[PDB]
Amino acid sequence: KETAAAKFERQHMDSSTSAASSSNYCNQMMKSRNLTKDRCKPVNTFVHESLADVQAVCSQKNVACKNGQTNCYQSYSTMSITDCRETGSSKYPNCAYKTTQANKHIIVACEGNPYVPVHFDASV
């Protein structure tokens, strides 16, 4: 029902800001995107770039994915990202996150026609 593409946008895209606003950013975002309904994801990354710049990653630098496949692409530039990692005080359903601001290259796996991002592989 929710495509892999759509799930990518829900889990990782945040074009509404240039960077995380407060230390509570990950707590608010994890909750509002419903990323903590099933369990507390241990880590998550949000990307603060336009959808078009992120989709364009699929025509950028081709690299190997962690699983060894070859449909992974690294952004030519660094992108503004927010790192969310569970704190020592997190127990489902009361997940808790540390928000960290970063600027790094993103690596995503792409698939389909249109060829779009479906999985966030790593940040470099």
Ligand SMILES: *c1cc(*)c([N+](=O)[O-])cc1[N+](=O)[O-]
């Ligand atoms: C989406 C986001 C997180 C998880 N999870 O298992 O942590 C699963 C899904 N999903 O669409 O299955």
